[PDB]
Swiss-Prot record, chains B, C:
Glycosylated position list: N46
Tissue expression: Particularly abundant in lung, spleen and colon and in low but significant levels in heart, brain, placenta, liver, skeletal muscle, kidney, pancreas, prostate, ovary and small intestine.
Localization per Swiss-Prot or TrEMBL: Secreted
UniProt name for this protein: Bone morphogenetic protein 2
Origin: domain of life: Eukaryota
Entry similarity comment: Belongs to the TGF-beta family.
Record's subunit section: Homodimer; disulfide-linked. Interacts with SOSTDC1. Interacts with GREM2, RGMA, RGMB and RGMC. Interacts with ASPN. Interacts with MAFP5. Interacts with FBN1 (via N-terminal domain) and FBN2. Interacts with type I receptor BMPR1A. Interacts with type II receptor BMPR2. Interacts with SCUBE3. Interacts with TNFAIP6 (primarily via Link domain); this interaction is inhibited by hyaluronan. Interacts with ERFE. Interacts with BMPR1A/ALK3; the interaction may induce HAMP expression.
Function noted in UniProt: Growth factor of the TGF-beta superfamily that plays essential roles in many developmental processes, including cardiogenesis, neurogenesis, and osteogenesis. Induces cartilage and bone formation. Initiates the canonical BMP signaling cascade by associating with type I receptor BMPR1A and type II receptor BMPR2. Once all three components are bound together in a complex at the cell surface, BMPR2 phosphorylates and activates BMPR1A. In turn, BMPR1A propagates signal by phosphorylating SMAD1/5/8 that travel to the nucleus and act as activators and repressors of transcription of target genes.
Disease: Brachydactyly A2: A form of brachydactyly. Brachydactyly defines a group of inherited malformations characterized by shortening of the digits due to abnormal development of the phalanges and/or the metacarpals. In brachydactyly type A2 shortening of the middle phalanges is confined to the index finger and the second toe, all other digits being more or less normal. Because of a rhomboid or triangular shape of the affected middle phalanx, the end of the second finger usually deviates radially.
Disulfide bonds: C4-C69, C33-C101, C37-C103
From Swiss-Prot, chain D:
Official protein name in the record: Bone morphogenetic protein receptor type-1A
Gene that produces this protein: BMPR1A
Tissue expression summary: Highly expressed in skeletal muscle.
Positions on the Extracellular side per record topology: 1-83
Function in brief: On ligand binding, forms a receptor complex consisting of two type II and two type I transmembrane serine/threonine kinases. Type II receptors phosphorylate and activate type I receptors which autophosphorylate, then bind and activate SMAD transcriptional regulators. Receptor for BMP2, BMP4, GDF5 and GDF6. Positively regulates chondrocyte differentiation through GDF5 interaction. Mediates induction of adipogenesis by GDF6. May promote the expression of HAMP, potentially via its interaction with BMP2.
Disease (UniProt): Juvenile polyposis syndrome: Autosomal dominant gastrointestinal hamartomatous polyposis syndrome in which patients are at risk for developing gastrointestinal cancers. The lesions are typified by a smooth histological appearance, predominant stroma, cystic spaces and lack of a smooth muscle core. Multiple juvenile polyps usually occur in a number of Mendelian disorders. Sometimes, these polyps occur without associated features as in JPS; here, polyps tend to occur in the large bowel and are associated with an increased risk of colon and other gastrointestinal cancers. Polyposis syndrome, mixed hereditary 2: A disease is characterized by atypical juvenile polyps, colonic adenomas, and colorectal carcinomas.
Region annotation (Mediates specificity for BMP ligand) ranges: 50-52
Length: 86, 104, 104, 83
């Protein structure tokens, strides 16, 4: 449970980050949101990560989050928003 | 504006008006936590599972509040004050200084 | 409206949409903390010295926020979920249930 | 540090109070505020009580708080607003 993963962070970087990277013992994540649309990334602690990486299909705002456990797997990830409901 | 984080807050015992019973120190850095707890909660926000779940629920229905930015680590400090007896006493106050913040 | 206290909050894994990976339980009582932290902070709000001092500072200048109502005691629960392997696993999640609230 | 003091509470009663009383290991308090004026009372935990019973002379709103350590010393206390 000692941090071993190095991730790219953007928008969710801790104050002591270095060159837009954070270290963690969980996952690296990328996320797109709306309301307009934006892209962010960061480090996610291991505990509670299954809840956050799954997210809820019934969130009010459309967004997609993706997780990975490989150094800087964050870097280049482009989740795609859920199709608008019609 | 931004996420949950520690902020500076210096408490001068004269500004609050306690220099009449607190002889030392003349003040101290207390700090304070403040800021939003968004989804997802990042590693450095060191939050509990409940906070995680509560944050997701708020995403499904905003009637439920978001987690709160509060101290998660605190250190003590020593002070020299005058008790009713007019005598200087040394006391060590716990949890006086915010060392770290998080979402709960 | 009122002071800091525990409120009821039942999380049904179907309403949030997790019944596809969580086999048991079908839901659980999570609760949540909410409410004001006024001056003075009463015994039952079980607060830290810092929260006390911060609350007084807010009384002198409202630029400084009041303490926050958050969980102070939490219990765990056990859940049965399906991992990517399609196998049912038993896991014990810590800090899932708010047992008590307080001002921090 | 086990609760031993019984106080009268009003406005600050814990949810499990009985006949407007709370138990504590600190002090019993009464307080008047303004902006109109109200009166409240309750139990104050021992830790941090010196801060709360002293209060700050420089609070934005005028109020007076008083503390005591005798069973139900709360009951009849009428602090008076500062001049």
């Amino acid at each position: 449970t000692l941090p071993f993963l190095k991730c790219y962070c953007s928008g969710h970087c801790p104050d002591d980050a270095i060159n837009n990277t954070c270290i963690t013992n969980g996952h690296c994540f990328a996320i797109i949101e709306e309301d307009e649309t934006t892209l962010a990334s960061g480090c996610m602690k291991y505990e509670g990560s299954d809840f956050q990486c799954k997210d809820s299909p019934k969130a009010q705002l459309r967004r997609t989050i993706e997780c990975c456990r490989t150094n800087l797997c964050n870097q280049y990830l482009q989740p795609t928003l859920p199709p608008v409901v019609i | 504006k931004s996420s949950c984080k520690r902020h500076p807050l210096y408490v001068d015992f004269s500004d609050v008006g306690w220099n009449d019973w607190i002889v030392a120190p003349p003040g101290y850095h207390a700090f304070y936590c403040h800021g939003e707890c968004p989804f997802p909660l990042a590693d450095h926000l060191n939050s509990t599972n409940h906070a995680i779940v509560q944050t997701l629920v708020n995403s499904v229905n905003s009637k439920i509040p978001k987690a709160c930015c509060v101290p998660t680590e605190l250190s003590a400090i020593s002070m020299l004050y005058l008790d009713e007896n007019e005598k200087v006493v040394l006391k060590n106050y716990q949890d006086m200084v915010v060392e770290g913040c998080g979402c709960r």
